[PDB]
Amino acid sequence: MMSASKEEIAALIVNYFSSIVEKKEISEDGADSLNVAMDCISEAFGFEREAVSGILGKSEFKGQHLADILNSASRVPES
Amino acid sequence: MMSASKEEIAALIVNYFSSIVEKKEISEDGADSLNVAMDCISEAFGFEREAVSGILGKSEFKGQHLADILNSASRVPES
């Protein structure tokens, strides 16, 4: 139902990055990259990292993940 | 139809950030944050920025944007 506000989008984005390093799927180098990137994401959108837990609590992306959301998408503009 | 692979997700993420600075909606500070963040995103997922144009050309997120994709999501796990 949400129109995907800035904080809401960033929330899913940083949450996904958190999930990547959570399951330690990414390489050490990339993990550090996601860290400094996350500081920048937080600085850019004007929110704190742990605030994602609150943002994704208010917004109804709950029970889902960014990639699961993208998985449900399907657009083939065959021009 | 895509299960949202790493590069595909990062593609939409960096594309959205590009759109933000494209329409100069974000503040100068945040714009710079998105720049260094994007270098980190690219380094993390192992792809180049301009490669997003190719990734979003192969994947069928075409004609859409990240936030438009998130807008079509709706999950209320009212427990």
UniProtKB/Swiss-Prot annotation, chains A, B:
GO terms for biological process: post-translational protein targeting to endoplasmic reticulum membrane; response to heat. Its main location: cytoplasm. It comes from the Eukaryota. Signal peptide: none annotated. It is found in: Cytoplasm. Disulfide bonds: none annotated. GO terms for molecular function: identical protein binding; molecular adaptor activity. Interacts with HSC82, HSP104, MDY2, SSA1 and SSA2. Co-chaperone that binds to the molecular chaperone Hsp70 (SSA1 and SSA2). Regulates Hsp70 ATPase activity. Required for recovery from heat shock. This is Small glutamine-rich tetratricopeptide repeat-containing protein 2. The gene is SGT2. The chain holds residues 1 to 78 of 346 of the full protein.
